[PDB]
């Protein structure tokens, strides 16, 4: 295990914990705000995936300050994880190309 593959893996586990904590905390944040749809755990979990990937369909979104603060942490964990996989793939390819050039 090279750093880049350990980091990629670490980021995958950590993203899964953020999707779950974020589902829980969003529901807690959002109930009490009239009109809020982000208020049961199963679709909160769907919401957290859709936010973390940045698809953002808009079937669900938080309307409270704390729902929105939670949503910002999910966006950033998701963009960073997926960026940390791209960076780990780039590290693999560069090494392979060196080895091939005979370097």
């Amino acid at each position: 295990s090279a750093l880049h593959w350990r980091a990629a893996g670490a980021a995958t586990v950590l993203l899964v914990i953020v999707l779950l904590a974020g589902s829980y905390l969003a529901v807690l944040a959002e109930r009490g705000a009239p009109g809020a749809q982000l208020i049961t755990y199963p679709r909160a979990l769907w919401w957290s995936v859709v936010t973390a990937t940045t698809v953002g369909y808009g079937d669900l979104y938080p309307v409270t300050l704390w729902g929105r603060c939670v949503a910002v942490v999910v966006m950033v964990a998701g963009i960073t994880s997926f960026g940390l996989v791209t960076a780990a793939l780039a590290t693999w390819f560069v090494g392979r190309e060196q080895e091939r050039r005979g370097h």
């Epitope: 807690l28 109930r31 009109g35 809020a36 049961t40």
Partner: antibody, heavy 118, light 108 residues
Framework: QVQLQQPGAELVKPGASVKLSCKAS????????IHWVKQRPGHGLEWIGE????????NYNEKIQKKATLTADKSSSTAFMQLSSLTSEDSAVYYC???????????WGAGTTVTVSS | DILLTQSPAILSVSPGERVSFSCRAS??????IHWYQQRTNGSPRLLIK???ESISGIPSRFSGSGSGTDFTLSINSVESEDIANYYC?????????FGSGTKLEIKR
């Protein structure tokens, strides 16, 4: 098993308060909300409010005069609703129900009949 | 806050016949509608959740249907144990709200 356990009745004097209770058993998750519903004699059900015992966070029906204050004791698996400064408009049956956070009341208490009289 | 309208308030059917209770929502709530039975001096009892999904415990006689603003609980072959008050409740938007309710009533 009986999952929610409520007292059968309380008498309360006009202007007095009372602390209703609800002892849960069976599966008691972190994810669980306890709800309180008020049924006046020959009327329908009114959602009054909800507490999550794990966090102790509570929301109320703001469409009505606020009489309730929801508290949970996580050690004794018990939800409380303090109803204060009661008139006769407040005479009713109050149920607790358990919602798993997917939006429906799976399991109800038998309810507490609260009579406000002198 | 969402408004659950249950009309009519009383429903008179003959024994063995099909009965339908209506719930209309004031704005679209998908299928986030659940139905409770309350017999004289009983607690409410979940019958249907998510509009059409069965709860085990419940006679197959009980069905539900509907999507958006129009929901229906059906009892195919009403029997005497069905005499009760039927309520709808939505979990689409905060807070949870109930219907005004519908008395079923058999003409024997």
């Amino acid at each position: 098993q009986v999952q929610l356990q409520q007292p059968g009745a309380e008498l309360v004097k006009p202007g007095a308060s009372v602390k209703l209770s609800c002892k849960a058993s069976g599966y008691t998750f972190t994810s669980d909300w306890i709800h309180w519903v008020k049924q006046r004699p020959g009327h329908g059900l009114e959602w009054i409010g909800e507490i999550i015992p794990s966090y102790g966070r509570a929301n109320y029906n703001e469409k009505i005069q606020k009489k309730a204050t929801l508290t949970a004791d996580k050690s004794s698996s018990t939800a409380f609703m303090q109803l204060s400064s009661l008139t006769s408009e407040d005479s009713a049956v109050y149920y607790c129900a358990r919602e798993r956070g997917d939006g429906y009341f799976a399991v109800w208490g038998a309810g507490t009949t609260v009579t406000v009289s002198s | 806050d969402i408004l659950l309208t249950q009309s009519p308030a009383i429903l008179s059917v003959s024994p063995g016949e099909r009965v339908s209770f209506s719930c209309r929502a004031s704005q679209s709530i998908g299928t986030d509608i659940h139905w409770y039975q309350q017999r004289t001096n009983g607690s409410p009892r979940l019958l249907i959740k998510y509009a059409s999904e069965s709860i085990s415990g419940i006679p197959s006689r009980f069905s539900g249907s509907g999507s958006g603003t129009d929901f229906t609980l059906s009892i195919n072959s009403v029997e005497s144990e069905d005499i009760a008050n039927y309520y709808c409740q939505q979990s689409n938007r905060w807070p949870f709200t109930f219907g005004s309710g519908t008395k079923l009533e058999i003409k024997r």
